[PDB]
Every structure is written in C-alpha cells, then in structure tokens.
Amino acid sequence: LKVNREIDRCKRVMRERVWPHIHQVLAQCTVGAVKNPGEPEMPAAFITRAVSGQVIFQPLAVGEPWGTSWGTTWIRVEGQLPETLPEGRAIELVFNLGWLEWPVGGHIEAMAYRADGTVIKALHPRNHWMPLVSADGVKDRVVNPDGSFVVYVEGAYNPNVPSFTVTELGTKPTGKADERYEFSSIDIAALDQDMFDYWADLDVVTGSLENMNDADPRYWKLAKAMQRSINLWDEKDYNTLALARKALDKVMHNPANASAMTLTAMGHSHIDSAWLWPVRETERKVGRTVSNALALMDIDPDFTYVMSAAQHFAWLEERHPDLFERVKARIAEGRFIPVGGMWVESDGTMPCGESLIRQISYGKRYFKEKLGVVPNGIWLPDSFGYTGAWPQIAKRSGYSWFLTQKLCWNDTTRLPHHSFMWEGVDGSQIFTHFPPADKYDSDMSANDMAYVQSNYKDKDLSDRGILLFGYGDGGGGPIREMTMREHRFESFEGMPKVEYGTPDDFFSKAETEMKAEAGSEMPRWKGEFYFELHRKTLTSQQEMKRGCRKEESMLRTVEYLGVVASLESADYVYPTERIDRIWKTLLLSQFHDILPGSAIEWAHRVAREEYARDLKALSDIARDAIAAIAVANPDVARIAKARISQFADVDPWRPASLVSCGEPVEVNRREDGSATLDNGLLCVHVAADGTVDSMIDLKSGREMVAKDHVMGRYEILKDEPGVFDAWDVERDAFLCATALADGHIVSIETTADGSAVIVTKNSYRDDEISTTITLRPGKSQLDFHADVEWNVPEKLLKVDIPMALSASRAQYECQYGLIERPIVKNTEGEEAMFESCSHRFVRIHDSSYGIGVANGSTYGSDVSSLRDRDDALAGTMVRMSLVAAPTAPDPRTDIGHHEFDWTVLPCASVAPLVAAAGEINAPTIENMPDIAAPITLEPIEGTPVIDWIKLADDGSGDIVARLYEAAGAKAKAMLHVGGTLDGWTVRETNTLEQDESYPDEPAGLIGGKQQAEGAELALNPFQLTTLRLSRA
Amino acid sequence: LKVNREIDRCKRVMRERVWPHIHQVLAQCTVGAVKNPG
Ligand SMILES: [Zn+2]
C-alpha cells in the first residue's frame, strides 16, 4: 500500500535529512590519553595526581583502539570555545569513541570529571554529550574567563560479552583489544532546539502508524500530514523548517479518547549487581547511571526517577561523595524516589526466611539513617519466581504493596490478571501489580503505548497502570529523547494518557479504586508464583548454593552462642560490626544473577572465595565465644563434635553430640556380595551394586522401597539446550537419562561408636562417584554421603529415591511453612512444572503414613509416579539434582570434587522430618559445654518451632526469638525460661523488632507485655511471630 | 508452541554442534604476499 511505502520515506528523512542537522559542529579539541590495563584506582586519587605533574598524556591515534579489555584510559580534553557562537543555542561536547548501538550497558562506557574531582556527566552509547553552555548565556564552572577549558574523561573499555556463547572474555584482564573501537575526533557542537523538536514530532507520528489500524480516520489524517510535512522541508533553505512544523500541527493537538487508560511513568534503570562483568565494575556503573539521572533533572522539571538496592546507594556513597549530596537534594524535593527497602534485589525463592528478613531489615535501616525515607512496597521486577511466603513477610514487615514483572517469560501459561491480591500460605494478602509493558526497560515508544493498552489484562475494572522506562540491565538510565517524546503522548488522541508520578501514590489510588469498583470480585491468587522457565538455575553453580546454606546455617549457631555467652560471662563484647559485615557480604551474593549462577567465570570466582573466607572467620567468633561459656560453667561437661540443631526430638537447642550411644548394629555379609544392615529400628538390605533394594520399618512393618526398584541408582542426563545454556533444562533431557547399572561394594565395616558403614564406587567414562551409606544405633533414618569427581561437561547428575507409598500430591517446604505440588501432571500447564525447588526436605505421605528425604545442599528435585513391571501401581520416584555443567558464560563451570549429604526417614507426622533436616544442616563445633537453652517452649498442642534466637540490634541487651508453626495445624504452647533470665518480660513485635501492630495480622501472645515465665502462645497454621524479651 | 522452540534448538545444533566438525584442520601453511594499489 502507498502509506506503508510512505512510512519508509519518512523514517529515512528522519535518519538522514533531519537528524544530522541537530548538532552543528563548531571546532574540534586536542586530546591526549594514558592507558592502564590493570585494576583501576579511585578517580579522586588520580586527578590530584594528574593536576600537578605526574602524568604525561601521550597523544592519541585517530582510528585505533583506545584501550585494552577490562582496562581504563584517562583522556585530557582541551578546547577553545571560539567566538561567533550561534545566538540562543546551547554548546556541548560530543564524544564519538566508536560506539555501537545494540547493547547500551554492555560495551564501552566513560565518565567525565571536572578538574577538581567532581562529576559532570556520564557517557554511554546512545547518550554521549556533555553540556558546556546551556543556551542561556550561563556557562559551566569548567570554563576560564576566556573560552579555555579542560576536561578529564575516565573511559572503561569493557568488552561485549555474549549471553550464551563460549568465550574467554569473562575471565580476567587480557591486555589486548579484542573488539576494535576507534577514537574519531571528540568535538564541540551547537544544539538546535527547533530541528530537535521537529525530529521528536516526526518520531512520535511515524511510530503511531505501525500500531494503528486503517479503520479509524486518524490513521489517514495522520499519514496525510506526515506526507505534507516532509514534502515541505528542504534542508538547503532553513526558512522552510517553520513551514514544515506547521503542517505537522493540525494533528498533534487532539484530546485523547474518553475511555483511554492512564499510565504513570517514572524513570528507572535496572542494574544487575553482577552479571557479564566483575563486581568491581558495578560500582562505576551505579555512579554513571546516577550522574546521568541528575543531568536529566535540568532538561525539564516534573521528571521523576526511582532507584532500588540500598547496597547501590552505599557503593555510591564511598566512590562519589559529591554525587551523594546532589541526590539528597532531590530526595527532599520529591523527584528522586528510593523504593523497596532491601539490601539487593535478592533471589525470590532460594534464600531461607532469615535471609529475606535480614535483607529487609538492613535495607530499612540504611534508608533511615542516610536518606530518611520509609518505603511502603517491595520492588522486585527481575527474579526467577517467588517463594509464596513473601506476602506474610511483607505484610508483617510494614509493607503495603508488591511489584513484579519477570513472570511474563513463562513458556506455557499466561497469568490471568495484572493487578490482583496475592495471598500466601498463611492467609495474609498483599496487593500486587505487573507493569503491562511486560518489561522494565522501555524506551517510551509508540509501540510500547500500543502494547500497554492492548495487552493490559484488566481493562474492564482498573483502567490504571504503571510504566517504567529507561535503558536497563546494565545501567545508562533514560535519555533526553525519551522525556521529550513523553510530552507528545500526554493526550495524543489514539493512545493512552501518560503522566509522571511516584510509585506510592499510584499504588495507593489504584488499589483503592479497583477495590471500591470491583467489589468482592477482586482478582486473587493463592499460592506461589512458579516460574515456568530457567529450571537449571536451582543447580547451575553448586558451590554457590552450598555456600549460601552453609554460611547461613552457621550464622544461626554463631548468633545463638552470642546470646548464651552474653548471659553467662559478665564481661564479653559481642562483635556486632564483624557480624554486620559478614551479613552484608552474604546478602550481596544472593543477587538474582549470582545465586542462580548465571554470571561470567570472574564473578563466581570472586564470590566463591568469599564464602571460604567468611566461613573461616565465622568459626573463630564461635570458638572465641565458647571460650567464655567454658569459664562461666567450669565443671559441668564438655563434648567434642557437638551440633546445636534447633527443634530436636527431645531437647530443642541442647548441643547434642555425634557419638550415637546405642547398642551395636549387626551386619550380615552374604556370599553373593550383598549385605544386611539391621539396627533396632531399620532392616536395610544393600544389593551387590550399591543401591539399597529393600528397607523395612521394623516398628510398623512396612516396606519402604517401591518394588522392582532400587534406592540409590545414579542417572546422568544429556542436557544441551537451545538457548540460555546455564539457565534452563530441556524436557528432552528427561527422556535421555541412562542409569549407571555397573558398580560394586568396595567396603563393609563398622566403627567405634557402633554404626555400620558401606562404601561404594561408581563411574561414567571419566568421573567417579563414591558413596557411603551409614546406619547409626538408635536412629530411624538412613544416611547417604557422596563424593563426586565430575569431569565431563554438558551432563547432569541426579539420584533417585523410589518410595513404596503412592499419593496424588508431593509435599515440599517453603521459607516458613509447606506447599504441595501435583505428582501426575494432567494439563499442558502442569507439565511445565517438571522440576521444582525443595528446601531441605521432600515428603510423600498419605492419611496415616509417609516417607521423607532431607538434603544438605541440593535445592532441586522432581517427582513422578512409578509403575511395576506387571503394570500395577508401585509407588513414587523422587529424584534430586546434584550437579550440572553448563558451558555458556563459564567455560569451565563445576569441575571436580563436590560433596553431597542426604537422609531418608519413615515419618507418619512431619515433626521427625523437620528434626532430621535441622540436624543434617547444622554445623559442628568443638569443646562445647552442654547447658539447657535459655528459651524453651513446652508443646501443649501442635508443633511450634523456635527458629532464630538472637541478640537485639539496638545494643540494649534484649533477646529476640523468631518462632513459627511448621505443621499446618494450630499450635498452643507456653514459654519456660532458664534460671539466667528470670524476672524478664516478654512482648510481641513485628519482624523488624519494633512495637508496631497491624489489624489484618494475628498475633502470637495472648495479652500484651507480661512476665516471660509462663506466657502462652497460640499460632494459627503457618504463622510467623517474633518475641522480644527485655530485662525490665 | 513446543515445535517452534524445537526448531531453534535444531538450528543451533546445526550451527554449532554439527557444522564445525566437517573440516578437520590438519596443518597450517606459511604465507607471503605482495600488495599493489594500482
Ligand atoms: Zn536483572
């Protein structure tokens, strides 16, 4: 059609006949540079060293790469600012350092400083210009009395790292220029605002023709004015410009339709704290983005910008002190908004409950003392699913709403609604919203308006949405082209109304109006947000998953010992600052890019050796605190190899030992190679090739292994996905798995305590798996411990546990509580859940029985039914993923020597499973005097569990316990305290240890603040309460 | 749909897992050149 061919003419007119005549080049500047391929130094220490004499600045070469990979080049620019400058026009430098266009935050960047150490503005691929004079006769401070000036530019020659492709770029500074980026004559230019407005109008108009339909007369009244204008603009006669704009004005002022939506736009750039670059680079990225944000708050007023991740604010505070005081000046104004008080945008499903609570707490604490703000909602646009315990934690932490967008990438199903009420397992509900643009980084195009209005899933009762724009995922922020195409879409009949705003006000009014409109028809979602994509993120880099749990499972012990030692010994200083530093370092390695393990080899290498260092430092605070208890109770008892595991079967926080102390375990070797372990409580029969093939529960007398199957068979899948190698698993892999039928028992023995051990070996073509199966006296559980020497890439290992019990749903655990997922997947959407998360245990049960499996560091599994060889129902298979080896961002990921531990239990109720999980995840310590816990609850009914006894953060000396219910039934208990804190009071708080109550949340205590000894507790299913004990 | 996403996997298999293993490199050759812009 004629119009579609007229759109191409208009776009080419924009690109060649209008765009170049915006920056009129006046003069070019002399340049000299100094290169450095090493690690960068602080800019302030370089400038003052670069002002006196101590740098030479050998001139650059036009047409050659100005740096090396992962290096820094400092450039001294000197211009002249000649006279006869155009009147009423702005003057600005233009830096064209060989930019590409596709990745904004990916390849090279830069930052321009003044000759005192102060930032001017950052330089990015699509935003490369620096204001000298502002079209009003006022100059920047870096201008002499004459036209002389001098600028320093720190340029980062970051390589462009492909997402999924084998490369050597994400390892270390190479010292070579792999991708060539030229220099090409930094220059000075005058800006023409009228041509720039004309280009903006053309852009707005021509982008609306691709998205309208040829049925409204506006499609034709537009395409006529677009044609009349470009037929009138002759770039060789400037006086025609004023004629061309008047033609493209009879259509720019048309009031929006009556029923059009209303969008609240705010500037937002998402910065992945570590992904495709080292963590030593994110600091500069935050600096650049923030500087860009403030240089756009003087192009126009009423422009708003949001920023999350208090850790980014801290990084900014240390590197650019001057750029911090400019932010605070905008915060008090109201145009700069910090949102979602959290340390970093953590992962949404893997961290435990205490991780999330501590993230919220540290974030709220930083946002208070520094910026003085109190956020009202959780900002989490990018995450691989959400745990389902989030609503309760958010509501009990003072929050009011919630924000997500990542759940659009699901491979099978689309969620029904965009704005809805999300109810967790407890019952508390939070208002949640997805930005209808289906992405956080928009460019404020006409395509995005058309999509937002034509995709919004609740247009019948909401007509209100949010809209984020800016260049994200690597920084950069929004560009001044986006802001000046927003004023065109303010009314613009044919498209949604758009206006600036803050998130809190949008959320308040949107929720209240949707409520008062819908009635008791408000959309609702109960449960978790299962992410139907990126299944391999549960096991991508195993040393990160093992590190997140081992460090956090022992922070519990270290913090508990600080409580016990601060009550026994009269002089013992609890090291608050070391613990705070360790906690912040931990919360930084739970970002949504490094816990899933989908970053470059460099990032994981640094994050891995941090776990080693903080693990070591933690087990010195422990032994130094235990030394204090050892002198306070000098003659009670001391045991080596103790494990303080919360919620045991008899004594909750007593430090139990490793010596089992039962009667020996009789072992009956058979002649064919098989063996028979038999303690008082189990009768295990191990076959000739590992693989326990029958397990009797001698108490009840039930087989525990599904017939014609063996427990412990190893499979190795062949996973070579289409895209996102380190991210997701094909379903095809589940078809290709091959068992390792070869194998044998290496050794059968008994030990000093009386337990029996069996040592097995297994191999697949290069690598070796040696398992140790243990049976201890007086414990109704079987323990497995495997050591892997993984060497072959592109493979995936997992073990299976065939259970002799058949049910319709499987039971996992959440951060606080439990969930169930189907076993046999019926519909198309259910088959998308073929692999799922599991914190610390999975249970398959029925009305009166059940079998459970608890793990140490795995985090991943999948369940399916089992059918006998005569085709009758046999049981259920539970497979849990151990280690995978991708190749995309990390060529040499997960090579060599992984450990794994797990255990299998017969459990009618859920209490012994929780006890076994807690007891397998606890760290070991030495020379620990065994003394009763200070806080104890006697269970009158149900199963309440005290999780995280710890000290107060106010330094006052109070105790804070975080107790919940872990069975799904109401629980009644009462508190008993030891003889070291009698006379103390107890009271109820929120998760942040503050006296704040909420009318829509039940409480634990009955009454108010009363005596601790004898206070009673009632807990409705999956409730999370926090007790605070004070001396008075 | 599942098939359209299975086409991408097959095309990438062609491009990376099948195509490079066609020309097995044995040895490289010494080279010398003379240039002429006329
Ligand atoms: Zn992200």
PDB file of N, CA and C and ligand atoms in Angstrom, chain A residues 270-273 275 345 382-383 440 473 591-593, ligand 1:
ATOM      1  N   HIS A 270      17.532  -0.607  35.622  1.00  0.00           N
ATOM      2  CA  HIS A 270      17.845  -1.787  36.412  1.00  0.00           C
ATOM      3  C   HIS A 270      19.320  -2.109  36.230  1.00  0.00           C
ATOM      4  N   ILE A 271      20.033  -2.270  37.335  1.00  0.00           N
ATOM      5  CA  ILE A 271      21.452  -2.593  37.314  1.00  0.00           C
ATOM      6  C   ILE A 271      21.630  -3.950  37.975  1.00  0.00           C
ATOM      7  N   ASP A 272      22.006  -4.948  37.187  1.00  0.00           N
ATOM      8  CA  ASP A 272      22.329  -6.253  37.740  1.00  0.00           C
ATOM      9  C   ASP A 272      23.678  -6.180  38.442  1.00  0.00           C
ATOM     10  N   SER A 273      23.664  -6.296  39.773  1.00  0.00           N
ATOM     11  CA  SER A 273      24.848  -6.078  40.599  1.00  0.00           C
ATOM     12  C   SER A 273      26.056  -6.885  40.154  1.00  0.00           C
ATOM     13  N   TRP A 275      26.671  -9.475  36.651  1.00  0.00           N
ATOM     14  CA  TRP A 275      26.289 -10.372  35.573  1.00  0.00           C
ATOM     15  C   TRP A 275      26.964  -9.889  34.305  1.00  0.00           C
ATOM     16  N   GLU A 345      18.420  -6.650  45.236  1.00  0.00           N
ATOM     17  CA  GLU A 345      17.265  -7.343  44.673  1.00  0.00           C
ATOM     18  C   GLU A 345      17.563  -8.834  44.681  1.00  0.00           C
ATOM     19  N   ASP A 382      12.820  -8.227  38.583  1.00  0.00           N
ATOM     20  CA  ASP A 382      13.601  -9.264  37.921  1.00  0.00           C
ATOM     21  C   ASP A 382      13.946 -10.354  38.926  1.00  0.00           C
ATOM     22  N   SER A 383      13.335 -11.527  38.764  1.00  0.00           N
ATOM     23  CA  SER A 383      13.575 -12.653  39.656  1.00  0.00           C
ATOM     24  C   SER A 383      12.982 -13.913  39.046  1.00  0.00           C
ATOM     25  N   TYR A 440      10.684  -3.998  32.103  1.00  0.00           N
ATOM     26  CA  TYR A 440      11.008  -2.824  32.900  1.00  0.00           C
ATOM     27  C   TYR A 440      11.769  -1.767  32.117  1.00  0.00           C
ATOM     28  N   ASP A 473      19.373  -3.101  32.770  1.00  0.00           N
ATOM     29  CA  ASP A 473      20.100  -4.366  32.811  1.00  0.00           C
ATOM     30  C   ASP A 473      21.608  -4.146  32.815  1.00  0.00           C
ATOM     31  N   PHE A 591      22.142 -12.020  45.029  1.00  0.00           N
ATOM     32  CA  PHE A 591      21.532 -11.291  43.933  1.00  0.00           C
ATOM     33  C   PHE A 591      20.912 -12.260  42.934  1.00  0.00           C
ATOM     34  N   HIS A 592      20.031 -11.740  42.092  1.00  0.00           N
ATOM     35  CA  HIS A 592      19.276 -12.596  41.182  1.00  0.00           C
ATOM     36  C   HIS A 592      20.078 -13.014  39.964  1.00  0.00           C
ATOM     37  N   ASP A 593      21.406 -12.974  40.053  1.00  0.00           N
ATOM     38  CA  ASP A 593      22.263 -13.330  38.930  1.00  0.00           C
ATOM     39  C   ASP A 593      23.418 -14.216  39.361  1.00  0.00           C
TER      40      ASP A 593
HETATM   41 ZN    ZN C   1      18.274  -8.202  36.454  1.00  0.00          ZN
END
